[PDB]
Design a protein around this ligand. Structure first.
Ligand code: F3W
Ligand code: PHU
Length: 292
């Protein structure tokens, strides 16, 4: 039978890789021989899951299984067993971890060339998603994995959703918890998501890259600075005002002028004024290839 069914009894828990409110990703060994020689895999499972979370998890599985890109984390299979909440998503395990941590650890040896390479790879992964009409909704350096020092892959499809065939956006109900500083203003204000709201998020990823995810100039830190001595204004309320005024994150010192221009375009107020990933990719490819 298919290599995509992993027997539950053979999955041996090792450690946690990620957690959210409704699920976790765990490092596990798939060990059918029982001698601790099996492959390592990353396994997602739900906790505190109601029907809605279970239904979304089914969606996540079917999306990831259908993606075949060098820049998207690889689906391996599922597992299940008796009773409920036992459905698991098995993926490849990337021991180098996430790009956010990699940039903070290795900042001093990673030049603008390499950051341009990462940006171009992430953009290609998002172009691939765009062609399949998938809105990722969690594009952030913490969800990008390092396959090797010159190869990254997009992960965390827990919020990903397909566009309908007849509409280029979708709307959610006022959900659980969003990373407000990565989200498009229409997403924040009206729960509208699209490929173009992902582009806005990509701009914030470029900002992360070219600050090396430094905590002192994180988006949240920059927001707090953009706050005058008013500390008790709800962040979301104030962010939305700042964005409406045309305020945006500053150009990082490591950031070439061309990349800053691309960030600014990713953050166009109107989603239809934002470039597609297919337009951004050649620009970043030119900049990467040119700095080699
Ligand atoms: N900021 C920050 C920190 C992020 C962080 C820290 C430790 C581990 C990981 C991690 N390693 C992974 C290795 N193979 C994997 N396969 C699929 C997801 C996956 C891995 N994840 C995460 C990636 C996002 C979703 C949750 C697990 C991310
Ligand atoms: N896209 C963008 O510029 N967002 C932003 C602006 C100010 C503070 C934090 C985030």
């Amino acid at each position: 039978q298919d290599p995509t069914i992993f027997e539950e009894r053979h999955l041996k828990y090792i450690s946690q890789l990620g957690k959210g409110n409704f699920g976790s990703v765990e490092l596990c060994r798939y060990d059918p021989l029982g001698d601790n020689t099996g492959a390592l895999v990353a396994v997602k499972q739900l906790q505190h899951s109601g029907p809605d979370q279970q239904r979304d998890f089914q969606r996540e599985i079917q999306i990831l299984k259908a993606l075949h890109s060098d820049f998207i984390v690889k689906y391996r299979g599922v597992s299940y067993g008796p009773g409920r909440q036992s459905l698991r998503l098995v993926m490849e395990y990337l021991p180098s971890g996430c790009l956010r941590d990699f940039l903070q650890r290795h900042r001093a040896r990673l030049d603008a060339s390499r950051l341009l390479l990462y940006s171009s790879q992430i953009c290609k992964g998002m172009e691939y998603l765009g062609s399949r009409r998938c809105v990722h909704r969690a594009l952030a350096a913490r969800n990008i994995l390092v396959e090797s020092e010159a190869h990254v892959k997009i992960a965390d499809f827990g919020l990903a959703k397909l566009l309908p065939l007849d509409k280029d956006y979708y709307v959610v109900r006022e959900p659980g918890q969003s990373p407000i500083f990565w989200y498009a203003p229409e997403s924040l204000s009206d729960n509208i998501f699209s490929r173009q709201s992902d582009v806005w998020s990509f701009g914030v990823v470029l900002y992360e890259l070219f600050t090396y995810c430094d905590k002192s100039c994180s988006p949240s830190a920059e927001f707090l600075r953009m706050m005058g001595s008013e500390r008790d204004v709800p962040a979301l309320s104030r962010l939305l005002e700042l964005l409406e005024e045309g305020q945006r994150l500053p150009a990082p010192p490591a950031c070439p002028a061309e990349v800053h221009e691309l960030m600014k375009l990713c953050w166009a107020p109107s989603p239809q004024d934002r470039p597609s990933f297919s337009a951004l990719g050649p620009q970043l490819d030119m900049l990467w290839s040119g700095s080699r």
